[model samples]
Target chain A: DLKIALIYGKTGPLEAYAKQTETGLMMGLEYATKGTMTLDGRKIVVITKDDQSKPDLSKAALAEAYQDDGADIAIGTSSSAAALADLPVAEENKKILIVEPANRYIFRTGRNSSQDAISNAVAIGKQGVTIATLAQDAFGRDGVAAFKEALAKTGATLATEEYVPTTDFTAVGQRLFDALKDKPGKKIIWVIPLTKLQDMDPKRYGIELSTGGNILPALAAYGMEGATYYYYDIPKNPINEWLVTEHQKRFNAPPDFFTAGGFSAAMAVVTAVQKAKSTDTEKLIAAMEGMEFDTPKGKMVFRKEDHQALQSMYHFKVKVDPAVAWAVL
Target chain B: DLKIALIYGKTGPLEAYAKQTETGLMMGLEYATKGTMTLDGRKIVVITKDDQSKPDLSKAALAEAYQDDGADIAIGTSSSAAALADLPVAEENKKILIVEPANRYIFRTGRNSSQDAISNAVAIGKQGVTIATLAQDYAFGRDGVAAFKEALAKTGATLATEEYVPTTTTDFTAVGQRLFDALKDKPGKKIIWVIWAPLTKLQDMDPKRYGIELSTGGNILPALAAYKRLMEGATYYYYDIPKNPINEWLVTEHQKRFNAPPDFFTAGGFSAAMAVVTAVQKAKSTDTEKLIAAMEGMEFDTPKGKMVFRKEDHQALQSMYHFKVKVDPAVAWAVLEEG
Candidate 1:
């Protein structure tokens, strides 16, 4: 039996992503466990944590998962900010943290932190628009840094770069708004990055926010021109089709971005568990290293040396959604 | 969030009971929590251990619950023989072990030793026999007879008594004749409760021609006797019925604290608690571990009372957790241990 602590931003800015990731996790676990919810005779038990995307909350929640909840392996966190904040806690506890997005004890398997991936998306996003990067934590920082460098080469000015606002947001939102200094439609572009849109109200600031990211909740910030990135819109392959069908049949709507990410993570973890037959960290880590993981978008492979997973990314757009506050298609 | 470790004989002799207990626990938790399984926004987790009627396995399983598995409270063990094995482990780790059987450190809701009573009830409790009893009129006879009566009460049997008979009746064919008359045509087995007096009288009385056999009365009686039947089973069943000397001691005591037996298992369950309760009452503390010599092998003992908690089994308990933290603080903010 395994005890999994799904540490995610259950609330706060990234909560939108957190919520979808969890839904996808539920869907994926159901799919992988064949609806039995068990591997071997042991069962899969999940302990949930709402990190609120706050470092303080994330760290506290992380400790609770390991120290109190008795989680054998910790997975899921929507914000890289929360991820980085608790990575050290995971290390300190000598517990494996499947970062989903790491260092010694941290592990990852997503699009963030990929140099070429961001450059390609940013380079495409530049088909010309003003870009001001808004992101939450380390993942946000990584994206902004790369896009900022890429944008520097093209005479395009980034409205402003705002990442990791530990406290005050009113000032930064205003500053970034001041940087945008939008005037009519002058091919006006706002390249946005967000785990979630918090602190800054773009509607009041009269600015559009766009980012190449998963998680449907950030669509509200789309700067009309919207986002184009390696994302998903009910992926079109067999596995992807099944996933989309199940979600649509169940939720009466198409699956969103991180819905794939969460399910994908669940697939990777569950697949590895199927082979590992244990809750042992290194053993599970071993099985996860080079997993030719079958994902919603298709085949994925991970590096044993660094635990970097290579997978296909679907570029998508932000559109109007009325389901549960925010979404992307 | 709380993680509960459930250790039991999932693959051993008691697997039948253990599995059901787990299923029962799952259903109970689901029902108690109303299916949300969340309390105060935190979800409770359950970890299962399959201790195959073993101590080493269960002991190892217990270590995982706290040292590795991080179970906050652990319960369930189908074997009393295997119960206390890892209870000390729970104590050693400063985690609460909520035992479903007899483990002195437990804070319980069911019978600590209820399984034994039920097991006997489940085992011999199935015999559908009708039998009669024969015994001396002395205290030993009465005590044994009464103990037999209670144990039998747990079973499905018809019992009749033929006690304090004349020792002078040499041929005793009359006794067997009456025994035959009573049980010859009964629906189940024909038997007699030949709890005869000292061998000095019936040393040569072959029991075959007697009343119902010694497997005789209440199937819980002579038919199914285990160690300390008098001390253990006697102290139960009629604990509140006032049918014997010991029952009288418990009848009023139980009457004041709770009500009457109310049910069959009630006395069995209650007496189990009473033994320890009385022990704790005498110790003025729950530290039975320290009360070892004061407990084991002592009858004329002043304070602790006529008792029997093997020195190996009577570990202690404390109330440090009952106070405040900073003045003291929370119960679980820091781990809690045995009292």
Candidate 2:
């Protein structure tokens, strides 16, 4: 018998990603288990726990899953902050914890590290123009540094660099617009990660969003695009088509990036169990090492070397779809 | 009672590091426990398992510790290969696994990725050199290569070639040849900065034939013999390097007891032990939740001076060193730069 623990931030600021992961997880289990949710005659039970994106709460919830609930396998985390809480617990309890967004902890069933960064780099690379950037920390700066390195290979130049504090992006966006407004050409790129809640009115500032895929609301509200790591409409592959169709039918909306990652993680877990023919974590890990599994995006492989799932990312533009939105490119 | 399962390759090629880690673990436990090895009237029992440096075997051993032996938390695996094995088991069993020398799957208790690479980069930037690197095709290699490049990113130097070979490489001829070819026509202080640990290529690869300079980090005292008369390079740690109270105790005691100095990984093992004991002592219980709370963003002393377990990822942040390898008629190295 498998008591699969789905732990994440389901009740707070980051709950959106967590909820989507939960939905994708259930769907993945159904798809992988062939709608049975049972393997080897053992019923697969999924127990979901939300830490409200709180590390302390997450720590307790995970402890409850193992100490009280006797979970055999674990997965899911919306915020790496709260989920960082999950890693110590998983290692402490010696549980085979699978991650949606890959962490230092091993045995990931999601997209590779820097998947979004890779896509964003590609998006910026497509423009052979001067690039201005606004970012949160030293992080986006470094990733763009590498992007600039590669872009320089093609002869594009980097212009003024700036940081956008999480607060007051409208003013910051205006400042960024003014900074790049006088650049010699219109092929300028603004590389910043925007969200539905923040920088929603970038259009008034004459700005563009060059980032990885975002939720439907953000994309629809902002009306922009770039290279995307994953979005429901972006993948024309058969698996993705099925995912979006079934997802919209069930949830009354399209899937987002994290939903697919959650789904991929679920498939990896269930497929490993079925192949190994046991719910034993040891056997599952052996079967999963370097294992290739099916995803809606199709043919995602778990690299044998690092246990990272290498999948596809897309380059996109959020234009008018059939309704209020976006990229099929 | 709290049971800690120490899983490592107790008998394979990298056993030197593992054994050294084990020694440090015992020493750390002794120092941490105040020679009691007990916490709050409860016995802290450490059970050891030898994975012989095999990944599958390491995974199984860790499960045995958790399932059969009732280990409260698990730590060991000097090899990142085996560390990966221990990770899933820790997660599935819902226990904590602390790793020495960072791996993809768990919190790290060793050098930060950029600490060494950055220090090395400043030196290279001084020389205004063009460089190529040879590494395995995995996270350790890729992340290492990426960080090294980032440090040298603004140095305005050419990073000519980056080559990755199979992780299970048993031979080094072809890999070295590729490095040689990549740097053959290169200009300005040509150096093939390599980060090889598994002796598979260390003893087998010939760097001079390519007219190439081989670079690497410190290793067990015996391994340095292979580089004799053939290299001039730098690495982060060597037992003989650091000068500090803890290191003075660690080095002198090691040389006195074993007739040879302890290796780099040995210091890492001791440091990890110091961290574990410090966390346990602070929390006053073996309960992992409390330990994590105590450990997060916690600072403590080590042979490397001070290391703090980053609150975000359980990775312990520590200062690393830079050493230049010089053949002393015996490959005796120098403390080129130390913090």
Candidate 3:
């Protein structure tokens, strides 16, 4: 039996992503293998583990998957910190670990500041306008710093710079209001936070907020204010077509960012397995190391640079219609 | 005198977005100065041109905006292609052009090749995922997913395979099977993320046959009816998912006035108007440079809470609503079940 362990966060903030990924992974496997559970005469066995969104628990669960469950390959640990923790374990065990739906800025060369900076700079130049920034601590701050360095050549100036804790909604709102109090022109507020704080409304404050990338589905409702958001969904291709259609049929709605990630993860694994022609760790790694596969979004090739696959970003504007119940970009 | 031009696709596929944007610009000017049309003592005037959704016409309209009106800034040309065509005009005229609601690849700095190469790789990097990309075969489809993969690659995910069909393909069976075949063997998640306008293929595709899950963003009323059918597992991000004062006001007022919910572009109009008025107040002088400076880092209160403008890209940074679809007969369309 070829054993693989699937770890998730059953409770807490990452629970939704974990559950959705689980659903997508299973469906993807069935779809990829055509309902066959065996690959190359070996039966594929999956073991499930729940971390409950705890870092320590996730670490321990990963260890258990390898030691107790005898899992040959493993996936998950929904939190970025937990995924990062599991990364070393995979390296140590010499097993392939697939991280899903976490933007931890880890993965050595595959995910580095250089690539993101280049992409962001390109996106900013395309708009051909000046920008402002408001972020929620670390992630937001780092993003802004990178963006500023990239925009130096473009002559884009920062109108305001402000940061607040991720969950600190009140302070964030006040800071934004003050920044725009005496500002001029049609500004773009680059925000990098993940929360659902209702105290501050950009329309009421008379400002617009934009982001560099896409997030989960629940976050779509907030994009209704006609603000342009830079993400990865604007491109047109066969992969995106399949993803959008299947998602609409199964869930009766569109897929969010994380959901797309989950779907993509499934695609990566299936393609690697097919190319390897064997589930052997060495073979799979070799196949995946520099693998290029087609997907709903488009063609994605994993660069040997850092094991990170180079991809594109999307730019969208929030559109709200009364006929529908949620926001569309 | 600095001139501003409004180029609208008076008759086109995206007429709705254009019409609302026009109303929004006018209302936005009024709202900026407590109903005063003058900015910094300079009388604010709008010159309108209709492109009729034709690219050549849009280019001609933009030219007129610059040459005839001497416009410093211009807006409109609803379609993505039209907007793309107008971009060069802005470059040539040294003027600024703001895209209203087009999701095309015009504003991306990465050339089409760079964008496509990167996003396509990312989409295929995910593990054990089966993908089905459903979009219009035109620019919207070709470019949207190309960028998606480019972005996905950065995250170290994988793309299994892709199936492209025509936008007008109302039946999705042939495509759905291909998606299933691509993901049948892998031992993980399976999804079909679609990027399409409100169409019948969404209503026709079977979710169970392929062991697939449906996912998409929110859309207009008539289209949302298709979404309500599979709300149980559907995941999406939408614009109007929250129940806040602005939404409540919009819902109540729209219900009272139109006997229907506010259409897709209603909030956009309201938001654009709010942005203009706020910028004017901040600048305190309608001088173009001063106005631009004041608006660069401005923050505004919107239905989505406070949004900040990024000085780097003039894009709005605001909250996005991630939701699960839910069906309720009492409502005309699917309601987002925010989790």
lDDT of 2 by residue, B1-339 (tens): 868778877897777668887887776676666789886677878889898888889889988998999987677786776786677777787667788642222557756433375455445445545667878898898888887777556445567889888887755555656666777755545666665442224323434444445453221111122222232223232112448777887778777988876666667767777777777778887766787788887888887788888877777777446689657645333444342
Model 1 misplaced stretches (Cα beyond 4 Å):
A101-104, A112-235, A312-329, B1-339
Interface root-mean-square deviation, each candidate = 41.5, 22.1, 13.4
- TM of each candidate vs. truth: 0.32, 0.33, 0.34
True contacts kept of 1: 0.00
DockQ per model, Cα = 0.00, 0.01, 0.02
lDDT score at residue B91, model 1, on the 0-100 scale: 69
- Cα deviation of A275 in candidate 2 (Å)? 1.4
* Clashes within 3 Å, all models in order: 19, 26, 181
TM-score of the second chain for every model: 0.41, 0.58, 0.51
lDDT of 3 by residue, A233-281 (tens): 2366665666677778988866655565556667777787778887777
DockQ of 3: 0.02
* Model 1 chain B weakest lDDT span, ten residues long: B298-307
lDDT of 3 by residue, B1-339 (tens): 335577787776767667766765665565455566876666677788888878889999998888877765666656767777787877676555656544211122112232253344335343344455566688877787787666545433356766678767755556765666675556444566666652224323334344555443221111222323422222212232457665666567666856766544555555554555566568775455675677676787554456656666766666345798665663544354332
Candidate 2 accuracy as TM-score: 0.33
Return the number of clashes found in candidate 2. 26
Where is model 2 more than 4 Å wrong at Cα?
A102-105, A110-238, A312-329, B1-339
Residue-level lDDT tens digits of model 1 in A1-329: 67888888777777767878888888888888789988777798888898777878888888899899888888858777678788789878777787753155666865643335546554544444465665675666776777667656655555556665444444455566666654432222243322122223343334544421221121233312223334212336876887889999988877776777778778877778778887777787777777778888677877778877777446798754565355443
State in Å the error of residue B120, model 2: 44
Error of 2 at A264 (Å): 0.8
Q: State iRMS for model 3.
A: 13.4
